[PDB]
Amino acid sequence: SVPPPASNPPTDTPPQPDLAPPPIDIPDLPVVSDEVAREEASRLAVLMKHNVKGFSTYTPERRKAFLTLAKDAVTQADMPVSRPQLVMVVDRNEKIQHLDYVLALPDAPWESLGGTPVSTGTTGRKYYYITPTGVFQNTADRLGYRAGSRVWDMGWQTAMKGWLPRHETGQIRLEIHATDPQFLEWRLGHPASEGCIRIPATMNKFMDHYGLIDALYEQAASYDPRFQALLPKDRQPTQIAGDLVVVIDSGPLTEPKIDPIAD
Ligand SMILES: [Cl-]
Ligand code: NA
């Protein structure tokens, strides 16, 4: 069977004239040397190994695929890498279904930290979408919410309907969700979502506490009480925090498949 769909409510940040800060009041994102960045990435990698269920470093061939396709995608999206920063790379291929944290460096080869199984969107089921490839940024344009378990809201995105071989797109609210009583952790590693990205509950808490993709969220929390209120009070944000979630597809690109029971 396929688990029921997650709820993916939009969380666009309302405009507030009273919170508009001058440039000096918005802190700059931390910039560390490549030497410091690599040491911090190694520390975080060891912590994830011992605190996130299902964590793995990958084989050399798999690491190369994560690193090459993620760099390819960021380059094609013309998104700049001007400081050492983490990137969450998700391989939606039906045969992989894993994420890899990568350290992007502006003037040196990127480095792989490791990651966990995930579940992205499945084919063959009406109203379930294939998770789209591309570069998705976690910005202060959205708040996300807490289920509490953190939910990251990546905005409306064009996605391919998973049940129509003719290739027909629609709009999904792309979000990152932990596992829960209706989407159990043993589902991870095979496609089973309606289009969202499911991650282990412990990976969700780790990302929340260390702020791995929350660089722009933390920046906004400096002056905006709505972002401050959603972030954990006991967090310990890493200086190499990033903001990009990059969905790749390494094998033959996912093709939709008919749902034999759809009318
Ligand atoms: Cl389940
Ligand atoms: Na998918």
Author numbering: 54 to 200, 216 to 331
The authors write:
A high-resolution crystal structure of LDTGo reveals unique features when compared to LD3,3-transpeptidases, including a proline-rich region that appears to limit substrate access, and a cavity accommodating both glycan chain and peptide stem from donor muropeptides. The structure was solved by the molecular replacement method by using the catalytic domain as predicted by AlphaFold2 (AF2). It is worth mentioning that the region comprising residues 56–86 (referred later as the “belt”) was not properly predicted by the AF2 model and was manually modeled into the experimental electron density map (see Methods for further details). LDTGo contains an elongated and unstructured proline-rich N-proximal region, spanning until residue 86, which we will refer to as the “belt” for reasons we explain below. Thus, the obtained crystal structure of LDTGo likely represents a self-inhibited state in which the belt occludes the active site from the peptidoglycan and blocks the catalytic residues. In the crystal structure, the capping loop is disordered and the L247-252 presents a conformation in which the Phe251 traps Arg266 from the active site through a cation-π interaction. In addition, in YcbBEc, there is a narrow groove that extends toward the catalytic Cys residue, whereas in LDTGo, a large and open cavity is observed near the donor site with a pronounced acidic character.
Here, we identify an LD-transpeptidase, LDTGo, that generates 1,3-crosslinks in the acetic-acid bacterium Gluconobacter oxydans. LDTGo-like proteins are found in Alpha- and Betaproteobacteria lacking LD3,3-transpeptidases. In contrast with the strict specificity of typical LD- and DD-transpeptidases, LDTGo can use non-terminal amino acid moieties for crosslinking. The YkuD domain of Gox1074 includes the putative catalytic cysteine (C264) and histidine (H245) which are conserved throughout LD3,3-TPases.
